[PDB]
Structure formats: structure tokens, C-alpha cells
Amino acid sequence: CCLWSDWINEDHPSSGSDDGDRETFDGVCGAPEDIECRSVKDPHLSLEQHGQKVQCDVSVGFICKNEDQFGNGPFGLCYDYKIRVNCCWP
Amino acid sequence: CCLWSDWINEDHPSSGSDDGDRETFDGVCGAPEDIECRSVKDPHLSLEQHGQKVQCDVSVGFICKNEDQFGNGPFGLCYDYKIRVNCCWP
Amino acid sequence: IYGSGHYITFDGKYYDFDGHCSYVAVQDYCGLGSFSIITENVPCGTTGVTCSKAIKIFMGRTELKLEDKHRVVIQRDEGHHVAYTTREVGQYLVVESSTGIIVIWDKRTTVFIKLAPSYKGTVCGLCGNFDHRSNNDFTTRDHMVVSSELDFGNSWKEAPTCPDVSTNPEPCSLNPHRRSWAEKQCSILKSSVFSICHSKVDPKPFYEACVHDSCSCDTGGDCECFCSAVASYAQECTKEGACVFWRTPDLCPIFCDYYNPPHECEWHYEPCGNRSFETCRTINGIHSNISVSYLEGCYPRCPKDRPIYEEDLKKCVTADKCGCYVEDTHYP
Amino acid sequence: RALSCQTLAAGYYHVCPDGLMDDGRGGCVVEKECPCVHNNDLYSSGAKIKVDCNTCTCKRGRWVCTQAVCHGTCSIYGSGHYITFDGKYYDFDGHCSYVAVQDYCGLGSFSIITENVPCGTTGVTCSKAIKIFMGRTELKLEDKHRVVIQRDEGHHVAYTTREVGQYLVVESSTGIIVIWDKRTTVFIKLAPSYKGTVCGLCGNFDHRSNNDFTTRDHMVVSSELDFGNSWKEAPTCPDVSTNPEPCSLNPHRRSWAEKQCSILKSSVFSICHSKVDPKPFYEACVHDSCSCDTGGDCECFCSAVASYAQECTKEGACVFWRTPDLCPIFCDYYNPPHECEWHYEPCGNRSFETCRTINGIHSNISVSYLEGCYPRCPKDRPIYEEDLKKCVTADKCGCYVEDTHYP
Amino acid sequence: SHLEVSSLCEEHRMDGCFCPEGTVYDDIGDSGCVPVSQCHCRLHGHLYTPGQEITNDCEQCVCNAGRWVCKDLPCPGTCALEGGSHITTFDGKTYTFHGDCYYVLAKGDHNDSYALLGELAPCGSTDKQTCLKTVVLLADKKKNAVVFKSDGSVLLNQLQVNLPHVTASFSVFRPSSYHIMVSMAIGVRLQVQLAPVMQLFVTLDQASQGQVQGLCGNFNGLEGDDFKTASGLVEATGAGFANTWKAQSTCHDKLDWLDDPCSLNIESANYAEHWCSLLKKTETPFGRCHSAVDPAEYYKRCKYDTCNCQNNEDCLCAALSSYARACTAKGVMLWGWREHVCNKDVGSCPNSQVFLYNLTTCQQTCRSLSEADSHCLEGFAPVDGCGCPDHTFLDEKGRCVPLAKCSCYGLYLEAGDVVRCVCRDGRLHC
Amino acid sequence: NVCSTWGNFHYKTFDGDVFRFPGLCDYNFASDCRGSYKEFAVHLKRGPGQAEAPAGVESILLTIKDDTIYLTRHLAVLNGAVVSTPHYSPGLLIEKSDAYTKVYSRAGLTLMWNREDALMLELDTKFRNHTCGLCGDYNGLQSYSEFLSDGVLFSPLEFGNMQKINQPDVVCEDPEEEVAPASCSEHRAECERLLTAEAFADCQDLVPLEPYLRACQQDRCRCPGGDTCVCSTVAEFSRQCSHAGGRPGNWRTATLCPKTCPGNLVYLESGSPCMDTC
């Protein structure tokens, strides 16, 4: 019993106050096995085909910072991301 | 050099997605000394004169949950809170 | 099709679908065909609800398109040219066809399609199949009757790369601060102003549409989302026999003396349309096949030295000097 | 040496012959017949223009104007915008009751109070009620109507309330005039006898604007927020510690606001661009439309575009900016069923006979620039009785005693 | 504090704890119904006792019974011409012009006294990219013309001069090679900035109040009549007022521009947002000035000039050095704001001298110690350039040696010469 | 008409004028220099230099009258947000095939770009005497005001450096004048035999031969070894063929620049994109 979770889009670039986009897995699971890191409005692109610089690991979750996206495109904003987590149940 | 911080109102009951009101001290300080726990629209009331049940300590910050305020008043919502932290600098 | 994704089929089934693609509204290419009407639904707001912003009408090889408060002719064929007619009746734009297809459009988001009763059981799309039996209107593109609003509506998208709608949004839950305004403005419908229509049209699905529409116009211009939802109910009231005068200078005002020659006062606000005057079409026998005398708007009351209203210039003219009307174009 | 009738007072530091000089219009002109320029228009000699109460004359390339002292105007409009009697623009978003004007300044005869409440969720406030204290009479402007509170026993300072266009106009016999568009915009006018004898959030009216930020304890500060927080009425009202930014707290409402409010800097208002500066009216309109996020934002918009078009009429440029899609107005609501007398006059300029002015009664200012719907009474009853919005015969109008219409 | 409440009292009377017949209630402190002549005043915090004076901006005030009694002190006024086109008059009143001519910036009204000109011509591609190019001063009964070109090159009556140049009626200094300081005996002081872009700062005494005309206004306290032309009436827009002050008759008339440059250029508007936002965030060394200067209007001009000009970093660093300039005018000096933003010239100082933020005229060589009362010219503002530390004054050429073997200034002799005056540390034994 | 770039830095204005500009920084491709109000602007950004033979495009920036479209190889961004294609807003259609990315605007603009190197633009006849980009002006006159402005004849290398865009952080060096090589006329027989084949029958009267064979001359002698520069010019000849209205035939054999697609998806020229899909 190691079913995947749902998609969690609980933050936005044009809202919030964390100056970017951060998606964490609290309220669902404690220590995951795997994490999937995709975008909302075009979900087949990898993280290397967006060109933005993020970190998305099983330890803390997802982090995008708007200050890191300076000089990359002409807009300088995070895209809208969403995540799954994989957790095993007895 | 142990100056108080500012007031941090970075969450609201009628917004967000944490089902209440939670104020944490990240981005300002790592391990505080003291924390002050007041309300926005009437800031001289103690936490025992609001009647809502909260936890507000130096470890994790401030937590109000809308499910804990059932049966207390006729409205059942958290009030709008704000915090200071005390940290010492060399 | 009206507001933030509300539907009523030809057999009278109400549902909600908030899709972001192009969708088949009506066609008779149903499993070869003669028309197709497409709707283009885009996000209007930030909550994920969508509303209709363009209509494409395919009749044979002619393609009209209703876009930016005007009609555009695209690809007029060589010698076939299925006879259609475009005129403006009140606040709405009305396209009619000689084959029995009638599209009525309030230039923002509300569309009314009408079909002659020769199209019984020969259409499909998001409007059903028009066979006077409403427990099969959720037939998908592959001829399967489903019970979900979201498996039916996701099968009539035009492009395969458009996404699937997996839930319907709740705007008054995603905008808690806009609920108190919406439920107070939209309570005109259940009030004593509309109390003549309360026994003739059920106000309850029009109250719920108005609150759904006003909680979700959160990017700008929400008093346009409101006044359209109150005029969808007052239109049914006129159609059933109850003329209600609901607009005031503070609530949804209308500006009909804009059209007057400088201070000669001929354009009046007729709140329920019911006036039959002489145009320069109907003086030469030309008549429509339905009754559009219930459409709200500003109507002329031409004087007694030129009592003939020429429609394509909004001018009252003498019965001799109006125009030509060949190939759906006004020639002076 | 090539003079130009515009560089007379410059000094000629760094064509026409000797004697003659250019005029900016054409050929070479003597110095005596030299024209005058005012707001990018060229006026020949002996021309007459008016400036707000005075009359000028182009004499010898210079203006010769009369010296009378005009009324002074304070403004309160939108989401916390002010203009003082001496012409100082600032922003203050306070949530209490505030002194707008009074002469109890350090004993007194009037007081005008504004009641500012939060309109939105971003923390900006707008004005929703006006209280006028004249002696012992208290008016109150609230819920689109005037209310009389505490009319005194035998003093009863003579005031008058009538409705001119879309606004409500209170006037007093002592020189105090309040003009109110029934939502958020207020205009206070004082007769020039009140020079240097008032205080509040509107300044002190002494034709010198670097002391308008005098606090209640008679101290000139440099902050908008130390000045405005000192004119609150209750001591338990909080202090405003920063001014909000609505288009930063609502990023999704910025694109609509900056596109709708760009009518002011467009070719529609291009006759007024040389006579009134559109730039502080563009910034007020965008600040107002990003912050009406709880409901009814097309009312916050149409008021900000009519604050600019009112100045344009007042300076001599009538602009017709409303369409059936942009801010429509409904003036044939008031007609007797299909007899068409109420017309939209976009710039007010019409002087018809009421049943006050047929009996000598006249005002002390000119309110013939106020937008709204005006009557055009027929020729079998050409006298407009104002307190019922009816055209009547000159005999059967009313009484007008103690500010009440008696038929 | 709120006296005379009962004259506007729309309530009836009830019970509760009150005051006696006189004896108003203490709001500012914490006591009870104290007498009226014991009311402690307040001023952003401190609880001033009734009688404690204070020295404010341009006035001094004493705490009377609850209210302040203030009395005026003499204080100057400053007209600024920053960017290519941002005029700030003597009475506030900031406006944008974009001209192409010589313009009268300030001149004395009597018949002669002085006249200060200035060229505002296009420097970039379009007409909306203008720059200051030449400052012309017509002083000493308008018979002496002084010209300040935008490469240094001060020249008097079409002839180059060597700096310093001290005369009887005026004097021109150059303390930091990108800064020229001009003082006049009439009461006029000039500061010409030369890098990154040319800017000008003018200072008058308050004796000349209501006695100047130009593009800097008339300096009378009101800012509603600064657009009053020299032929009567007040104009509406800045470009209609300023076409009346052309110093040449053959110049064309200019008009306003109701556009913003950050919409016409999409590539410049992200660079403008990222770097001009440092004036508003508090982690930077600009949040120290937020209690005094209120950067909300410098932020709007910083985005204006950055999106508009062709060399975007020279307009960024000029607009960041004008917030720091107008913050040192109110005490708060920003030591070290050039470490992340505009430090392309900090480390380029020579071998002995370093980059300073408080360089003034009277930190000069030992030749300045020879006069020591002739040319010091107090009353200016400190500027930022290459200079020597708290000791080791500047020698005749090159590095700055310490005080013992500085010089003996006649020609500046070395530290081995005996007249009977042995050359010594600064002073001479004569 | 049509402006176009392709291949190894080949350009083609609205009025012919095929030249070769090897600039690598950031340029203006076409723009509305009317003066009163700018309707559109198309900014081209060449890459860092892919190799000797190909010449890619890193990104395209496009601003139509209110809103900014940013196209890269993998994603399309409208006003800072990623769009799912097709995108149907009522003045702007943005759709993405397997080959091209199209942008259709109501202002009379049509952009079409395979995601490596070929970029073409189409404007209606409203914008005549107003365009000012590297695509020349749109007056209809062959080489009149693009290269001979005030009597002085501009070379194509100094015409391209005039069209540059200054970015306010990066200094990018203009390409210097190379030493004038030999006019490669020793391969005119191979370009004439190849491009006038039987597959290009009903386009010899539509599009000319002399510009696109002149561009074939440099692609044979500047790209030695493999043939990847000659089949981006005849691939551009079969796109100018099928834009005027003609229909070319298949020329790609198994030894003359083949292309591969998965399944039994055969490659063709001039077939309709509207497929019935089961």
C-alpha cells in the first residue's frame, strides 16, 4: 500500500506573501518516499524545460523564489506549480 | 542588544488555506527569547479576554484553528492576530 | 448559455460546466450535416470559472463570427450563399437564417440559439438533442449517456490538447469577502419588485446564478456581471406576460437619449419591447419567423414626416429614401 | 536683437527689423499691439477672460487683472484624497471621525466632521458621512439624504438645501457652502471672510501652503500621518502607521484599473490637457479601482472620471465623455411618461427660472458647472419647483418657510 | 489635548466618574483631572514638561499649557535640477519638463543682480531623452559670464581658468573632481554635479524671499503660484509655464508627455523594478532614512529615469545618489550605501587615498593651511569621492604624506628648507 | 507580404532583399514606427552560436498593443503566465503544432516559427510606410530606402547593427567585417539542378529563382561536409511555394535530408493540418 497522493496547489505567484511559490506536504504525510514536481497550466514539461531555478525534494518540499528569476525572462515571476507525494501505509 | 521585532500580520481568517490564523517568525529570527500575542483590531486585550483557544509560544509561533472555535460564539471564526518576537544580537 | 458557465438544453435541463477550450454548442454532424455553432469559453476571474466570449457560426461554407460587439463575415462561398440576416433588436444582436437557425446574442456572454421544429432529434452538442425527452441530454461524442456533468462537457471540446475539467469551482467560497455584496444586490429577484413574475417564472435558479456570477468577477467590472443576471430573469417575465420595470438611476442605469438627434426626443427605453413599428424591411413584405418583441432595449418612435425606421444606420427616414438590402449589406 | 513677445521678460541673453518684433502668430508687430498667451491659446489686444471671480485684459502683451478675493475650496474625494484651501494634495487613510474644517482653533461658530470607514479589504478608507455643526443646528449628510438634528429654539441660522444635478448643495447665510455627490466626494467652500481663521484637515486658508500641516497642538509637522492622526475626534481611535498600496495588495486588479482609467490621458479629454493637469487624477483613479474589491467597482471608477471632467468645465472646456457602455446615465427616468423634458446636460451651463429665483432669491456662488440631469420646462408652465422635481405655473409652486416646502 | 469637546456634545448625561468644575482630564500623561496649566505636551514620543523648549526644522517651540508656541528661525531654500528633466522649485513643487533651449533658472529682479541659465537639450535618440549640458552664470552686474561645461572645463569670458579661483565677489572650488562648489557674496550658492549625469543644486538665503524669478519659482511659501508667468497669470502645466523662460527667441515650444517610459520599454522595466525597489525595502542601507525622507516619491522618479534614458545604469545611480543626498540634509548620513549597487568606481581610488562619503572643501592641502581663513566656505553639503583619512593631509602632488612632512607653501617648498623659518608640520616658525 | 529568416543567418525583407547578417545579440525584427501609437513590435534573439552550420533562435519577444508574448523552444508565456495551447482569447490565437508555433492577431499580424531557426511574419496592407525593423520598410520598393538612405549605400552588416536593442545589463559585441571571400560560383550547377526539380513545378511562376539560389551559394561553401545548410534554403523555397497558393511535391529522399516521425506517420509537403483523429 504505497499509493500516490493528489495534486497540491496551495500557493500562487500572484498571491501569498512568500515572494514566490512554495508547496509543502504537511497535513497529508510525515516522511514521503517520492515527490513529483510539475506545472499547473502545462503539466507535461519537466523542470528543466521551464528554465526557472527551483529546488523540489522529499525533505522540505518545493521552493521557488521570485528574486532568483531575475534576468531569466522578461517578466521575472515564478510559474504556477503543483506537487504529489508518495507515502506507504501499513 | 535585545531589541523587539515589529508586528507580523501575515495571515488572516478570511483568507489563506490553513483554516485559521498562524503567525511564524521565519525570515526574521531563528530562536527567540520572548513572544507577544495580541489582536489587530483591539490590541490591549489579553488572550484570556478573547475567549478563543490558541497556543502562542516561543517554539513554533501562533496557532488558531477554526474547528476549535465551534460552540464558543455564534460566528465560529478566529480573530485577526499579530505577534512580536524578541531576539538578542551580538 | 449565460453567465459563468450556465446551460439550459433544448429539452430543459440545467447544468454547470466551466471549461476552457472551444466547445460544440449545437451541430448536426452527429454520427452528412449542415451547420455547427461553436462557443469559446475563457477564464473570467481568478477562481477558475469560465464564461463565453465568442460565437462561431458555420452554415454550409459561410462562417460568421460574433466577437468584440460585432459580427464578422469570414469565407463567403462562391455562389451558394445560404441566406442569412443580421439586425439589432434592443440591446441584442440577432442573426437569422433561411434554413431555420436563429442566434440571439447580448454582445457579452448570453447566447440564445433557436431551431425550427424540423431539427427534432437531429442535433447534438452541449445543448442536447431536441427530442422532448431530457434523460438522454448527457450523450457524449461517442454516443454514450453518462451521468456526470464533467464527463459529458469534456467530450465536446474541439482540441484534443485542451485540458479536462476535474471539478467545478465555488466562487463564493474562494472569495468570502464578496459574498455579502453579492447576496444583497441579487436579492432584488426574490423581492417585491418582481412579485408579479413570482407565480409565472421560478426565481430560484436565477438567484443562484446571480450570486455565483458576482462572487467571481474579481478582476474588474462586476456591475456588468450583475445587471446581466437580473435581465436574464426579467426577460422570461416579459415572455410569460409580466412586464416589470426594475431599472433606476442608481441600479443598472440605461442611456437611451444618447441616440437622439441633439434634443429631438425619439429613442425611448421600452422595458419590455412590445411595440410594432414600421421598418424599411417590413414595408417590403420581409418578415421574420419568430417573435423577438420581448427583447429589452432602446426603441425608436419616428415622427410623422418620416415614419420609417431604417435599421442599419439607426435613422428614421422617409419611406422612399432608405436603402437597397442586397447580399446582406445596406446600400444608400 | 530679435525680440519675440514671449521673451520680453527673459532678458535676450545669447526676420523682424529694429523696432518691430515677432508675435508668435505671424508677421512683425510693434510692442504696443503685442498679443498675450494663456494655456496655449493666443489672445489679441483688449481681450477679456475671467479667472474664477475676476476679469483680465490683454493690455500690452501682459495681463491686467482685477484684485478681488475669491471663495476657497477644500476637497475630499475617493479613497482618502485631500486638497486643502491653499492647494496642497495629500493622502490619509484614517478610520475614525476627523475634523475637516472648524473655527474652534485655539470662541468659534462652526464645525464640519467627516466619518471615514474602510471601503475594501486593503486598509484604505473613504468618506461616508458628513456632519455640519452651525451654531446649535446640526445637519447630517447620510444615506443619500440630509437629516436635521437639534434645531435650536429661536436662533436658527438660515441655511438652504437644494439639489443641483447629481449633487446635494447646502448653503448658509454666514458664508459656508457644502457640496456633496451623495457617495464620497465633498466640496467645502468658505467666503473670503474666513481667511486665516480655520483649521482641520483642510488647512487654515491664508494663501501660504507650507503651514497647512499644523496639528491640533499648533505644531507644523512634515508628516502626513502625524498631522492627520491629530485631528481624530475620539482618543481611543487608532493611529495610522503607514499608507496602504492597493495595486500591490491586489495584483490581479491592476490591469483593469490602468486600462479603464486611461481615458483621462487620451484624446477624449484632449481639450482639457492644456488647462487642467490630468496626472493626479489618473493616479487617484487607479488607486481607487484597485481597492474596491468587495463590490461595486464601476461606481468607484465613474466618480474619479467625473472629478476630472468637473474641473474641465470649471476652466472652460465642456467634454462629453459618457457613452452607453462607459458610465451610462439615466435622465429620461424622470420624465412624465413620454413627454421629454429632463435632458442630460454634460456641463450644467443653463440658467432657467426656478420658483426661488422668480422671487429674488439668489445664491452667492456659481454652481452652473455641476453635471447632472436638468429640466427644460414647457411654455404653459415654465417655472421649475425644485423640492418636488415638477414644472409648475408661476403661481402654484409653494411657500418655502423654515426650509420646508409647503404646497 | 481635545479641549472644548462639550460645544459639540450630541449626548445626554448619565452617571460615572468625572472631573471637577475646572481641571481638565490628563490624556497625554496618565494622571487624573489635573489643572490646565500642567498639561505635558508631546512630540513623536517624548513627554515634554510645560516649559521645555525644542529646536525644530525652521522654528523653535515651547510647551505652553497643552499647546506649542512656535517662533520662526531663518532657514534657506533649495532649487534642484536633477535627472535630465526633474525641476524641484524652492517651495516644493516637483515637475518634469523635457526642453530644448537655454532657460532662465533663477535671476534677480532689480535690474542686474544675477542670472543663472541652463541648457536642457536632448542627449539620447528621441526628444524625451533630455540632459543638462551647460550651466551659465551671469554675475557681478552681468559683466562676468561663467560657463560650466559637462566635462569640467570651467571658463570665464570664453577663457579657461584654473581651479581654485577666489575673487572679491565670488569663488569657485573643486573638492572631489566630480563636484564644483560656487559661492557668491550676494547669497547664492551652486553645486554642479558631473558624474554619472550632470545635475545642479542652487541655494538662496531667506532674505531673498519673494525676490527671484525663473524655472525655480518665486520662493514665497505657497507652491500654487510657482507656475505664474512673468506676464500675469498662473499656467496649468509645467511645459506651458517653462516656454515663457526661454533665453533664446528661436527655440521651439515644448509640450507635455502623458506617457510612462516603463510601458514603452519592456526590457528596461524589469531592471527598473528590481533595483529601484531597494529604496523601499528595509534590509538595505536605505531603511535608515525611511523615518525621515519617505522614499515613495523617489521610487517613482527612479523608475521614470531608468526606463527612459539610453544608459540605464547612469540614471539608476544618479537617482539612488539623490535619495542619499536628500537624506544627509536631515542628519542621517548613509555611510556605505555603495557596496552592491553602484560600486563601479569605489575601488578605483589611488594608492594612499580611499573612497569617502563626507568629503568637504576644508580637508585640502597644507596650502589651504597657509591661508586658513580666506577660502573655507561653510554652508555646503558633503559629497562622496576619493580622499584621505582622518589625518595625513594632501601633499602638492600624488599621495598624501602625514602632517610632519606635508609642505611649506609663493611656491610650495619641501620639508628641508630654512628661510629664519624651518619648514615644519603645517605651520611655520616665523 | 512576408518577411522571413531561416538557415545560416539568411534574411528576406518585405520587398525581397535577401542578405546575410551573422549578428548574435538581440535585434528588432519588425516594429510599428508610425510615431503616434505603436501597434506591434517583434524582437528577435539569436542564440549563443549553435555550431558552424545551423543558426538557431533562442527566444522571440512580441508585444501587441496591450500584452506581451514570450516564445521559447518549449513554452509560450502570455503576460508572465504559461499558456496551454491552443489559446482562444478574442483578439489573439496562440496554437502549437508538432512543427510550428502560430500566433494570429486581429491587428493584421501572423507569426509562424518552427522551434529551431525559421521565422516568418505576415502583415496586412495597413502597415505600409510604417514598418521599421530589420525586415525593412513596407513601401513596396526593392532596396530603395533600406540600403540607400541619403545616397550612401549601406552594407547588410551595417544595416543589421543599426537594428540592435540595448539591454541594460549585458554588453554584446557586434560582429566585425570578415575579409571578403570568393564569390562561390563553383556550385551554381548543383543549386540550379536541385532547386528546379520536378517537385517544384507549379511555383516557378509564383516565387523567383534568383534570390533563393543566391542564398544557396553561401550555404554550400560555408557549410562543408554534411548537407544541413542547403536543405534549409530549399526547405524555405517549399514554404514560399506553399504560401502563395501552390503545392510542392516530395523532394526529401533517403539520402537528401530525410526526416523521421514515429509510427506510420509519413512526411509530406502541402497537406492539411486538419486530421480526423478516431
Ligand SMILES: *[C@@H]1O[C@H](CO)[C@@H](O[C@@H]2O[C@H](CO)[C@@H](O)[C@H](O)[C@H]2NC(C)=O)[C@H](O)[C@H]1NC(C)=O
Ligand atoms: C422563414 O422560414 C421560411 C421557411 O423555410 C423561409 O423560406 C425559405 O426561404 C428560402 C430562401 O430564402 C427558400 O429557398 C425556401 O424554399 C423557403 N422555404 C419554403 C418552405 O418556401 C424564410 O426564408 C424564413 N424567413 C427568413 C426571414 O429567412
Ligand SMILES: *[C@@H]1O[C@H](CO)[C@@H](O[C@@H]2O[C@H](CO)[C@@H](O)[C@H](O)[C@H]2NC(C)=O)[C@H](O)[C@H]1NC(C)=O
Ligand atoms: C449671501 O451672502 C450674504 C452676505 O452675508 C447673505 O446676506 C446675509 O443674510 C443674513 C440673513 O439671511 C443677514 O443676517 C445678514 O445681515 C446678511 N448680510 C449682509 C451683509 O447683509 C445672504 O444671505 C447670502 N445668500 C444666501 C442665499 O444665504
Ligand SMILES: *[C@@H]1O[C@H](CO)[C@@H](O)[C@H](O)[C@H]1NC(C)=O
Ligand atoms: C567621515 O566619517 C568618518 C567615519 O567613519 C570619520 O573619518 C570622520 O568622521 C569623517 N572624516 C573626515 C571629516 O575627514
Ligand SMILES: *[C@@H]1O[C@H](CO)[C@@H](O)[C@H](O)[C@H]1NC(C)=O
Ligand atoms: C507611401 O504611401 C503608400 C501607403 O501609405 C504606399 O503604397 C506608397 O508606395 C508609399 N510611397 C512612398 C514614396 O513611400
Ligand SMILES: [Ca+2]
Ligand atoms: Ca505566494
Ligand SMILES: [Ca+2]
Ligand atoms: Ca502553486
Ligand SMILES: [Ca+2]
Ligand atoms: Ca488563513
Ligand SMILES: [Ca+2]
Ligand atoms: Ca493574523
Ligand SMILES: [Ca+2]
Ligand atoms: Ca433529449
Ligand SMILES: [Ca+2]
Ligand atoms: Ca495655509
Ligand SMILES: [Ca+2]
Ligand atoms: Ca511660490
Ligand SMILES: [Ca+2]
Ligand atoms: Ca523599400
